[PDB]
Design a protein around this nucleic acid. Structure first.
Lengths: 113, 228, 47, 158, 61
RNA sequence: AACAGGUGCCAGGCCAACAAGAAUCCGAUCCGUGUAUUCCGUAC
RNA sequence: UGAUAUAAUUAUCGUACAAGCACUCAGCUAGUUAUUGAGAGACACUCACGAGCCCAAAA
RNA sequence: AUCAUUGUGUUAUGGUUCUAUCGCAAACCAUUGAGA
RNA sequence: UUGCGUACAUUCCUUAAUAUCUGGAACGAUAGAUUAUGAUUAGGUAGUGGAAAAAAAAAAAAAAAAAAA
RNA sequence: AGGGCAUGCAAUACCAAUCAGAUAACAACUGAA
RNA sequence: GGACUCCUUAACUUAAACUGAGGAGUCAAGUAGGUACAAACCGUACAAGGAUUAAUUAUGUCCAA
RNA sequence: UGUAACGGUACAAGCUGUAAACAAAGG
RNA sequence: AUUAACAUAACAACAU
RNA sequence: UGGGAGCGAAGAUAAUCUAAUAUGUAACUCCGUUCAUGGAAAUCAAAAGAGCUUUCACUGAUUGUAUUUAUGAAACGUGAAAAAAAAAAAA
RNA sequence: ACCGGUGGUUUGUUAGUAUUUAUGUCAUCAACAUGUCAAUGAAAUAUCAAUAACGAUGAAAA
RNA sequence: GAUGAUUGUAUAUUAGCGGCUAAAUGUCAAUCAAACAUGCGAAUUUUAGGUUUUCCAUGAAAUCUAUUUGGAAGAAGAGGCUUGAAAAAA
RNA sequence: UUUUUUUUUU
RNA sequence: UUUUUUUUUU
């Protein structure tokens, strides 16, 4: 008595596995994207209390509540996985420590180098 | 289910006769290597020629056991040993095609049948039986049936069973291509001969000018000089 | 993943760098040594 | 497929852009300020501080004294003149790397400069000469080789 | 891992039974053997300075 | 890939009914298809 | 003979130490994978073309 | 370089895993035989 | 009153620095031979980063190299 | 393939509603494959 | 959602190595030295590496030293 | 078709089927 | 025929 | 055989629980695979037009069902492979 | 271009391999026991001679 | 106990979503408040074990909101890191 | 077939 | 304009 392996079966299943594996696609949330807006400037959303009681509120507060506000940077991480399709590339200010470009350089006779 | 597609795809490979022909082009590579080969088992019983053992000869009378032709008698036309198959007249007709010749627009042809699906009829009894060979003192071979114990009749002559194969003719015609144009089909030997004559002057002329009415002459061919 | 592989490698290395070794001499490494020699002989082949 | 939107900034109804300058052709470009000067703290703070006192001090500071019109001679934040002369030779197996320093506290600001200049000038010539000798050496070697080959052939003829 | 295997055997040369041959035991043994020398080579100085001071005082007296 | 088999171990020119060197030098015992050089057959 | 020295490993605030495994050796044994992803102020390599880049399956 | 002697060093013997094929198409290519 | 013992020198000799700022934006260059009074340095759990190795297999680049033979 | 080739694998299925056995007089008698 | 000590302080039997707060050091993640014997105290120009060298520190100077 | 039992062979993981390792010469 | 653990033997030592 | 027909639960996810996914998945019975399955319009489209059936790519993880967890080779349309209305009143 | 006969390639030098049976349980059921068809040697058609020793063949032995 | 709810025997019936039970959770192939065998139905774990070569650079926390807030830091967010410097003669 | 396509311009 | 398919004669 010896153990005989099912090469036919094993190879058949492995080919299927590989084929399936290398055929995948992205997935995005529905509810999430149903409550967000993408713009050139950044993500957009609504303010809470819109549908709530607004009796004890001034005009200034009402106006702001009726408005929109950008999504905080702390929450962007979620989107990475939630909304792979939709990607927002942040663009911060330049960071250059070159003394040559500084205003001080103008008073100097020449440039450092 | 979300696995049918892949399943089928995988299965197809089995039937696939990999590798397949592939013509080359400019800056192009083949993909045949990337095609997995089919899976097969080696250890299996060796083949056998059932035709030889059953004492079944071309032109013999047989009857269909199963299939659409539950009871139908015929004459064996062809036997294939490697496939273990036989061809019986007036039975199992499924292969249809366009008429390659004179007649109707459609013609059918008989298809091969497994040897196992047929049996030899008894001479007198007219029932499926077995046949055994017996050798005489003189070396004469006689085929004797089991049921009746009687001698079998001789086979039909091949000249009578010879028939044309129109399926092959249709395949040969298809291999060439679509039908030719009427205009193009028309012969023109008068101008074809002039073109053929000009072809030799162009090829074996060595750049020599063609003959003219005022100068009907042409430079002779030059031989291959040896390296002294 | 063991002392055994070090012994096999040391043994191998001690015989690889030689010529005119017999089958009885090479031992388990006979195939390897033959492939090495045939590989080496490739440079001497001209059109 | 997928969309990749870039972020933008708004200011006074205008799209903010990074600083950019045009090209100003110049007939002759003056020498730059050595970078080594920045390695100290007095200038480092000056540069790192954007203030009127700094800008005024900058004006007063004489930048022209540290400029050296001689290759191989540079200023060091240690308060010295560094002399650099690096060369390699694998053929002759000779590698040289000068790291001479001329301190100010020993000689002076101008004296050191002068001395360094002189030293580099000297080294140049020295190198030149050495190369010129190596060529003749090579030639000689060649000649000896040829004579040895002829002598070897003599024995075969004998 | 701390020490090569090839060197442990060398270092454990001359020790008692099972400790000159056992990788397991040898490890722990060798570690301490090297540690002690490591530690003592730094303190070797004051132990000789005190001896020199004592001999000088003896002589002087 | 001359892995086509064998001949004492790695053979295009040796056995294998059809082409082609008992080729020369080197070799611890020790045959040795092995190193160096060279010739030839091939629509194999 | 003189001087000197508290097996190793993990957890833990704690060398925690009288807690857990191991007599020794030989063989096997625990971070595998982008035809589908990527630079997001706790760290993100490199090649080609350029307002233009890639080209899917047949072949 | 502490064997005082029951230790250590070298070497040798013993123990010690175990691989010599009895095989290689149903696919493709080339060639040949009778009859259309 | 005047004393003395004591832990730690990068004085000497040999190495190392990868999140944009150590001179170095220097020199050299046919693919870098390691700076002699050179400044800061180099204890480390968790986490993070750089670099050198692991005797094997494949590739149709294992003889234009002194002397000797 | 000249010749020969005990025995066992429960076999009217080269045909024919179903339900035990050498495959069942009606009815009793029922059913997702 | 921390172990010892310094100052202030809540609770407790002005008790306990408890329970919980405000702000400094050490350990955690620190070596060797001193405190007789086992992290927390003093000192350190505090452990890349090697050798037979010089120094005001906690602190010592009858013997073990 | 594929296999199990008994017998023979040299009692055997082979071969074989009481004709149980062969008829080769039909005038 | 064959590594280690393991088993036995021979030689080597004197400031004791 | 992850093919087709009958019947068909649970471990698991939702950090317990209902729906839901797993999955019409596993076990049981039957058909036995290109000589198969399928099929030559009372269809789709909307104001143009395509013209039996079948395979691949893109449209597109778009629309839709769900939500506390997922699932989804959707329809029209484009490219490409293979191309098939009927032999026929009898002798 | 079917059909018969001959040869070669790929699958496959890169991948692999199973048929006999001792032992457990009432049964279902589970299971890789024990180097090779094998003294050794390329060759046994080289294993000679015999009483101790020296002798024979073999690259190597009693 | 032994003239009686005596003992003993061939071949038989009740099958786990169960049967047996003069009623103990006693028994059904010598640890049954729910038996044993098989499973491409390819088993789940806020607990807990293990996690394999060197050298170098840099270098933590035991704090906060929320989770009907826990305890042996579970999950999510915030906070905490490479900023600077430190080389000189009338 | 997918992606991108200045907000400046005497 | 900067290209290209070989049998005549089973």
């Amino acid at each position: 008595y010896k153990p005989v392996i099912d090469w036919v079966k094993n190879r058949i299943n492995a080919r299927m596995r590989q084929y399936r594996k290398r055929s995948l696609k992205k997935k995005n949330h529905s509810k999430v994207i149903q409550r967000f807006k993408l713009t050139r400037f950044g993500w957009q959303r609504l303010r809470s209390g819109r549908n709530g009681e607004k009796e004890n509120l001034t005009h200034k507060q009402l106006k702001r509540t009726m408005g929109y506000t950008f999504v905080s940077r702390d929450d962007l991480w979620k989107f990475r996985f939630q909304l792979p399709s939709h990607i927002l590339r942040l663009r911060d200010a330049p960071i250059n420590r070159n003394p040559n470009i500084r205003k001080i350089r103008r008073s100097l006779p020449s440039y450092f180098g | 289910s979300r696995y049918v597609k892949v399943y089928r795809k995988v299965m197809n490979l089995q039937r696939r006769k990999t590798p397949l022909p592939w013509t080359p082009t400019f800056l192009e590579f083949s993909k045949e290597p990337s095609v997995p080969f089919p899976v097969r088992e080696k250890l299996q019983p060796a083949p056998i020629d059932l035709s030889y053992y059953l004492n079944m000869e071309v032109g013999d009378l047989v009857e269909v056991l199963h299939g659409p032709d539950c009871g139908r008698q015929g004459v064996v036309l062809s036997i294939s040993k490697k496939r273990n198959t036989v061809v019986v007249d007036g039975c199992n007709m499924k292969k249809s095609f366009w008429n390659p010749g004179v007649g109707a627009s459609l013609i059918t042809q008989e298809m091969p049948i497994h040897i196992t699906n047929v049996a030899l009829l008894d001479p007198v009894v007219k029932r499926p039986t077995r046949v055994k060979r017996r050798f005489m003192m003189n070396g004469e071979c006689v085929r004797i049936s089991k049921l009746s114990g009687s001698a079998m009749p001789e086979p039909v002559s091949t000249s009578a069973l010879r028939q044309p194969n129109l399926y092959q003719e249709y395949l040969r015609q298809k291999a060439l291509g679509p039908p030719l144009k009427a205009s193009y089909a028309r012969p023109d030997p008068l101008h074809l001969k002039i073109l053929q004559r000009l072809a030799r002057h162009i090829s074996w002329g060595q750049g020599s000018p063609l003959p003219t009415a005022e100068n009907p002459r042409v430079n002779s061919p030059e031989p291959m000089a040896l390296r002294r | 993943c063991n002392p055994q592989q070090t012994r096999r490698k040391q043994q191998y290395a001690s015989i690889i760098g030689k010529q005119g070794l017999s089958k009885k001499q090479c031992g388990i490494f006979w195939d390897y040594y033959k492939r090495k020699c045939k590989k080496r002989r490739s440079t001497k082949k001209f059109i | 497929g997928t969309q990749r939107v870039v972020q933008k900034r708004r200011h006074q109804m205008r799209i903010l852009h990074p600083a950019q300058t045009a090209y100003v052709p110049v007939e002759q470009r003056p020498p730059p300020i050595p970078h080594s000067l920045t390695a100290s703290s007095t200038v480092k703070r000056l540069l790192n501080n954007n203030t009127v006192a700094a800008k005024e001090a900058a004006k007063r500071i004489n930048w022209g004294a540290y400029i050296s019109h001689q290759r191989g001679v540079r200023w060091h934040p240690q308060g010295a003149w560094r002399v650099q002369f690096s060369r390699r030779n694998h053929e002759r197996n000779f590698f040289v790397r000068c790291e001479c320093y001329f301190r100010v506290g020993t000689y002076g600001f101008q004296m050191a400069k002068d001395l360094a200049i002189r030293y580099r000038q000297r080294l140049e010539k020295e190198w030149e000469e050495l190369q010129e000798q190596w060529t003749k050496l090579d030639i000689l070697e060649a000649e000896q080789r040829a004579k040895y080959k002829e002598k070897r052939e003599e024995h075969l003829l004998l | 891992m701390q020490i090569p295997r090839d060197v442990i055997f060398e270092v454990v040369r001359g020790f008692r039974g099972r400790s000159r041959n056992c990788i397991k035991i040898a490890r722990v043994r060798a570690m301490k053997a090297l540690l002690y020398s490591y530690i003592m080579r730094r303190q070797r100085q004051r132990r000789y300075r005190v001896f020199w001071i004592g001999r000088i005082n003896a002589a002087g007296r």
